[PDB]
A paper describes a structure:
Herpes simplex virus 1 (HSV-1) ICP27 is the signature prototype of the family, and it is composed of 512 amino acids. The C-terminal globular domain found in ICP27 has homologs in all herpesviruses, hence has been termed the ICP27 Homology Domain (IHD), whereas the primary sequences in the unstructured regions are poorly conserved. The protein functions by interacting with RNA via the RGG box in the N-terminal region and also binding to cellular proteins to promote the export of intronless viral mRNA via the TAP/NXF1 pathway.
Here we present the first crystal structure of the folded domain of ICP27 comprising C-terminal amino acids 241–512. Complete details of the structure determination and model building can be found in the Materials and methods section below. The ICP27 C-terminal domain structure is a homo-dimer, each chain is composed of 10 α-helices, 3 helical turns plus loops. The most striking feature of the dimerization is a domain swap comprising two segments that are separated off the core globular domain and interact with the dimeric partner. Firstly, the N-terminal region containing helices α1 and α2 (residues 242–275), adopts an arm-like conformation and embraces the adjacent globular domain. The structure determined here however revealed a different binding site: each ICP27 chain coordinates a single metal cation in a tetrahedral geometry via the side chains of C400, H479 (via Nε2), C483 and C488. The metal is not surface exposed suggesting its role is primarily structural.
Author numbering:
A (entry chain A): 242 to 299, 303 to 512
B (entry chain B): 242 to 512
């Protein structure tokens, strides 16, 4: 019969023996210490780089904003910085992974666009797509973030479109399944993340839906953000579910209104 | 061959034709307006309820210290809130929808607290021999705290679970077997996955066995606060058995989330 074994039950209760405010502050202190100088004195070289501000171990969207034209011109420089500094890149990748997994909804949308715009730029210049660089390497993080936030909404929305469920889209990972902006974002990110996870040497352009001799003309920078905000707004015109309208609305307008009832902690 | 069809490419490119700063302000306005009075005329009745503060469309952010209860207080006052949930299905569905959104956007410490809130609530129901109902706002949003914690801890747990000789995160949440529980991490994810599964299957009431509790038993193995205390602990101690620098970095940044590095640009050509 399936059950929690006796010894494990003791392990779980024994948590109380080592739980205390003091112990918590000491444990936090050790993690805080790690975050003080994570690059350990081997940051990205920033000499003569236009990306120096974001290469340092020192984020405001508007402050770090670039036009597409600027990304085309200076993109290769950042690409070369990533490729030429493996230790810093692994550091950066680890940190970026955590950032993307805790970003709010608007921030997550921007990270999705940062990812695809970065791929668009590489394809524009006929550069290989490098799974090991910090941006492509953390595709799964923004995918996971967006899936967690949008899953309830997409359960209804994707049904209205007559499309596969979110889980199905992300497991099938077929270009042929893309029929709207939601399926585009999740299928492409899922395809990209899957290639990264398998540890391929480089990522085929077809992964991004780009054929031989073509470029990523069907994606414009900002489309993830603009597109997903729009359907969160417009789906209510075709849907009679109040629960759905609340869900869509609260994603777009996140200030807390209701839903927490108590905090109970007997241990510290 | 596998390709993005031409019709869909038209749809995708047309996003630009409608994208504008104004349009975004208008859309945000419509969502903000819904959130002005989400219970829309049918709030929880709160007369002579000790839970009145958290039953209204509150005016400001949830305060963990103000809304703190001892286990003894939860046992005493729990049945009242339970009765309010069960007695007001329309208000409860509204509450459940909002809580689901909250839990899916909470930060790591908040997520831990919501896991304990969920399990302590279950333990209180079991204490009183009350049915576990999927329509209950707290039980009903189990999947939300599950998804959030999984998103945040997945890279850490890949290494940690392997060191403990346990199943992977995905396997744990797929198999959903009590026999796979051998530590706090597997406990939290297996139990939440089991509970979330019963919720989505729309059962009348959820068997206590779902939470690993047999006939007449009281969930002795769970102490309120164990999710938060336990998971904070392993994020601290795993580095002692693991030689990986980047794993230590991952664990530390989860515990200490202020931004340091990792974002490179913002590019939006549409608005
Ligand atoms: Zn809907
Ligand atoms: Zn490790």
């Amino acid at each position: 019969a399936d059950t929690i074994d006796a010894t494990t039950r003791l392990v779980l209760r024994s948590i109380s023996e080592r739980a205390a405010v003091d112990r918590i502050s000491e444990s936090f202190g050790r993690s805080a210490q790690v975050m003080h100088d994570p690059f350990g004195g081997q940051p990205f070289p920033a000499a003569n780089s236009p990306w120096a501000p974001v290469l340092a171990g020192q984020f405001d969207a508007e402050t770090r904003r670039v036009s597409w034209e600027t990304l085309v011109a200076h993109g290769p420089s950042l690409y070369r910085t990533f490729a030429g500094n493996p230790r810093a890149a692994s550091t950066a990748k680890a940190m970026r992974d955590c950032v993307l997994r805790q970003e709010n909804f608007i921030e997550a949308l921007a990270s999705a666009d940062e990812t695809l715009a970065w791929c668009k730029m590489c394809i524009h210049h006929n550069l290989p797509l490098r799974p090991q660089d910090p941006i492509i390497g953390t595709t799964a993080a923004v995918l996971d973030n967006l899936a967690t936030r949008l899953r309830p909404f997409l359960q209804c929305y994707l049904k209205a479109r007559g499309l596969c469920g979110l889980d199905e889209l992300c497991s099938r990972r077929r270009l042929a399944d893309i029929k709207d902006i939601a399926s585009f974002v999740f299928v492409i990110l899922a395809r990209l993340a899957n290639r990264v996870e398998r540890g391929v040497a480089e990522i085929d352009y077809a992964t991004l839906g780009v054929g031989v001799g073509e470029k990523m003309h069907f994606y414009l920078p900002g489309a993830c953000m603009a597109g997903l905000i729009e359907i969160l707004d417009t789906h209510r015109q075709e849907c009679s579910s109040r629960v759905c309208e609340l869900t869509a609305s609260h994603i777009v307008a996140p200030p807390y209104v209701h839903g927490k009832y108590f905090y109970c902690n007997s241990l510290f």
